[PDB]
Amino acid sequence: MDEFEMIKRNTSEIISEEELREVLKKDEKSAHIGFEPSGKIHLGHYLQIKKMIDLQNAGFDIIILLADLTAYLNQKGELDEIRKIGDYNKKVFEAMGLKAKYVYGSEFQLDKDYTLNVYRLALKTTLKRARRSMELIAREDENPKVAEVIYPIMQVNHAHYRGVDVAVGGMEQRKIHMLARELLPKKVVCIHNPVLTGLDGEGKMSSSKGNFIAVDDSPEEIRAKIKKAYCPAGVVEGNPIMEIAKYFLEYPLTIKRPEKFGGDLTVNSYEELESLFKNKELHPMDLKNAVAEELIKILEPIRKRLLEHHH
Amino acid sequence: MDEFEMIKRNTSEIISEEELREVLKKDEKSAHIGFEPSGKIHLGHYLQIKKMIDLQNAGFDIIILLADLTAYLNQKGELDEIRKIGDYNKKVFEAMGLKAKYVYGSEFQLDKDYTLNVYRLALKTTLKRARRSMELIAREDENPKVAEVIYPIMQVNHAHYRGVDVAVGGMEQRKIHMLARELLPKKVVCIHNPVLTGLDGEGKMSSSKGNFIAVDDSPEEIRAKIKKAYCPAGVVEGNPIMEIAKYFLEYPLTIKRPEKFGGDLTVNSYEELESLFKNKELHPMDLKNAVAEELIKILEPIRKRLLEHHH
Ligand SMILES: N[C@@H](Cc1ccc(O)c([N+](=O)[O-])c1)C(=O)O
Numbered sequence: 029m030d031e032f033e034m035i036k037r038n039t040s041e042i043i044s045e046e047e048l049r050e051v052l053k054k055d056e057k058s059a060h061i062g063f064e065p066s067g068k069i070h071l072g073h074y075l076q077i078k079k080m081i082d083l084q085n086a087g088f089d090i091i092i093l094l095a096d097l098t099a100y101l102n103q104k105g106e107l108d109e110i111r112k113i114g115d116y117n118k119k120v121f122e123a124m125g126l127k128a129k130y131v132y133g134s135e136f137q138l139d140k141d142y143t144l145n146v147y148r149l150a151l152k153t154t155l156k157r158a159r160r161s162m163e164l165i166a167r168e169d170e171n172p173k174v175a176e177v178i179y180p181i182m183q184v185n186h187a188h189y190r191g192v193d194v195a196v197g198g199m200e201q202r203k204i205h206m207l208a209r210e211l212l213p214k215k216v217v218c219i220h221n222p223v224l225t226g227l228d229g230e231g232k233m234s235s236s237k238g239n240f241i242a243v244d245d246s247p248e249e250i251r252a253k254i255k256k257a258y259c260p261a262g263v264v265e266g267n268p269i270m271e272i273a274k275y276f277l278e279y280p281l282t283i284k285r286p287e288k289f290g291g292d293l294t295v296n297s298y299e300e301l302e303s304l305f306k307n308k309e310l311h312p313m314d315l316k317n318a319v320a321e322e323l324i325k326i327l328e329p330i331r332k333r334l335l336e337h338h339h
Numbered sequence: 340m341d342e343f344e345m346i347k348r349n350t351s352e353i354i355s356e357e358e359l360r361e362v363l364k365k366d367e368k369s370a371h372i373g374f375e376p377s378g379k380i381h382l383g384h385y386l387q388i389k390k391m392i393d394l395q396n397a398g399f400d401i402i403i404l405l406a407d408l409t410a411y412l413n414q415k416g417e418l419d420e421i422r423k424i425g426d427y428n429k430k431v432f433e434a435m436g437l438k439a440k441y442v443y444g445s446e447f448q449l450d451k452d453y454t455l456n457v458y459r460l461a462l463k464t465t466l467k468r469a470r471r472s473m474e475l476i477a478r479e480d481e482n483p484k485v486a487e488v489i490y491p492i493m494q495v496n497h498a499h500y501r502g503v504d505v506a507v508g509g510m511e512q513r514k515i516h517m518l519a520r521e522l523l524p525k526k527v528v529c530i531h532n533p534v535l536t537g538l539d540g541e542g543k544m545s546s547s548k549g550n551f552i553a554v555d556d557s558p559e560e561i562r563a564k565i566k567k568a569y570c571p572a573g574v575v576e577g578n579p580i581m582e583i584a585k586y587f588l589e590y591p592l593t594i595k596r597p598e599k600f601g602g603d604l605t606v607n608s609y610e611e612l613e614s615l616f617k618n619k620e621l622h623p624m625d626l627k628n629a630v631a632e633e634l635i636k637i638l639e640p641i642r643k644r645l646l647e648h649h650h
């Protein structure tokens with residue numbers, strides 16, 4: 029497993045693998061990701077931070093944007109409060125083990141030169157394209173605002189401003205990134221991570237949809253959340269519990285079961301787990317129980333680092 | 340005729356007359372108008388400059404924005420060239436007799452605080468409202484750009500930034516001004532001047548439609564343009580020649596005619612002219628001839644001031 033395969037692990041798409049290969053030959057390389065500050069940091073965040081750590085171990089210089097200004101544009105409240113959530117988010121990301129350069133968008137995104145560039149990009153971006161690129165990002169609004177279409181070109185310009193080699197995001201970011209790749213002189217390699225299904229199975233996992241597991245949830249909270257989750261037997265597609273097994277659990281893995289249900293079961297790989305589960309050889313409740321306990325152990329260091337701040 | 344009536348002369352609407360009355364009681368009062376730089380200055384410009392001179396004589400401090408940045412947003416070309424046209428436009432406005440403070444939008448519209456305000460207004464302005472407000476302003480584009488909707492909120496913020504008492508524009512500006520009146524804490528009095536019909540009668544007079552009389556056109560040019568113009572007998576509505584008689588000619592006025600067509604005719608007022616013309620007592624060609632000669636004499640000082648620069 030070389031650096032390229034490590035980086036590709038568990039991604040949905042890399043635009044493009046040949047360009048990424050060229051980047052990996054450089055000694056000095058940069059990757060960045062931006063996060064609108066969020067009041068709870070959940071497994072979707074952690075999946076992305078995990079990817080930044082992968083890149084960091086591949087020799088990348090890592091930048092994390094606390095995207096306070098685009099969060100303001102996306103109707104998340106005042107800037108001062110957004111900034112305070114940003115500082116909390118940074119502490120969580122540090123607790124996750126990421127030492128990086130943390131920057132607030134408003135530190136530079138209001139400079140004359142940045143703004144002039146944003147306006148130059150606004151001349152090249154159609155309203156229709158801008159709106160399409162925000163479909164999975166914009167706060168729901170029956171009356172969309174001008175701010176919605178300024179949002180994507182801020183994110184495009186950021187990649188230009190920083191000269192970063194690689195941009196990372198969830199798949200929800202992919203249309204903004206392909207806009208960047210179309211408009212900017214330097215083409216950024218984009219790495220997109222899968223969108224986690226929320227615990228209800230109804231939509232995507234989000235801080236605003238109340239369908240997430242937070243990295244600092246208590247053990248009892250996690251058990252309850254998993255126990256209630258959508259997880260139909262034989263079904264992997266849109267199964268949030270199977271997703272968690274695929275992206276966060278360490279293998280080989282021992283699923284503990286009562287002997288009257290077959291007793292303990294050791295899987296050496298997610299793919300092994302997947303066949304057992306598709307073949308209805310693994311009951312949803314036994315999967316839930318194992319996922320819950322292993323995730324508790326996975327998140328424990330993060331929760332304890334954050335709880336030590338209170339102590 | 341007091342200051343209020345002088346200011347109201349030949350306007351299409353004042354939003355609102357009661358607010359304007361309150362402004363006129365102040366000793367220190369400000370009015371502004373903005374112009375995207377234009378390669379030819381025409382009678383539509385002159386009508387608006389005439390209104391600024393009216394205000395100036397009413398004791399208003401006058402500001403003229405050479406709107407280089409919004410012109411850039413509206414797809415009029417580079418900024419450096421736009422700025423050069425702006426400087427030419429200023430010289431024409433001076434030749435028209437307006438001594439004022441001339442400012443370029445880019446001198447201040449890119450400052451951090453200005454931009455932050457623009458983004459705050461973008462949170463309160465719907466895309467639909469922004470687009471509607473640009474219907475008569477935006478360059479024709481089958482694929483409208485994000486820049487189109489940033490444009491109006493720049494103009495709104497400008498009024499906020501300057502704290503001006505009065506904003507002046509053609510009626511094409513009225514939806515942007517009513518947006519300003521809705522969003523800003525200080526309500527600006529808006530004075531709207533009529534939109535001149537182009538010489539073809541087909542649409543509005545514009546620098547880009549080639550249907551205008553420029554203030555520096557030669558006498559022979561003006562005669563030709565007027566001679567070719569739409570001017571149907573008995574019709575005042577959308578008659579560009581009658582419009583010119585109403586907004587630019589001095590009364591009383593002598594229309595010279597051959598005796599075989601009734602001989603010279605003296606009208607003491609546009610309204611007099613209008614009845615003679617509606618009653619088909621005035622032939623279009625005699626109207627054209629008089630309009631042409633009087634307009635030539637009206638524009639002569641402007642043309643000579645500008646021609647003295649070459650000399
Ligand atoms: N769109 C990201 C936030 C973001 C990512 C990258 C960026 O460069 C910027 N930005 O420039 O403000 C913002 C989100 O959904 O959380």
Ligand SMILES: N[C@@H](Cc1ccc(O)c([N+](=O)[O-])c1)C(=O)O
Nearest residue numbers: 163164165166167168234235236
């Ligand atoms: N179309 C997406 C947009 C969206 C998704 C998730 C979110 O958390 C937010 N949000 O915070 O505003 C917005 C949706 O399902 O709503």
Ligand SMILES: N[C@@H](Cc1ccc(O)c([N+](=O)[O-])c1)C(=O)O
Nearest residue numbers: 373374375406409444493494497
């Ligand atoms: N919309 C005006 C130009 C303009 C008027 C007033 C203004 O404040 C600004 N502006 O702020 O850039 C621009 C035109 O059609 O020519």
Ligand SMILES: N[C@@H](Cc1ccc(O)c([N+](=O)[O-])c1)C(=O)O
Nearest residue numbers: 474475476477478479545546547
């Ligand atoms: N809808 C208007 C917009 C417009 C009018 C006049 C103009 O000069 C320009 N322009 O310069 O782009 C634009 C039109 O008839 O085209």
Ligand code: NA
Nearest residue numbers: 053054055056
């Ligand atoms: Na080296």
Ligand code: NA
Nearest residue numbers: 364365366367
């Ligand atoms: Na006084």
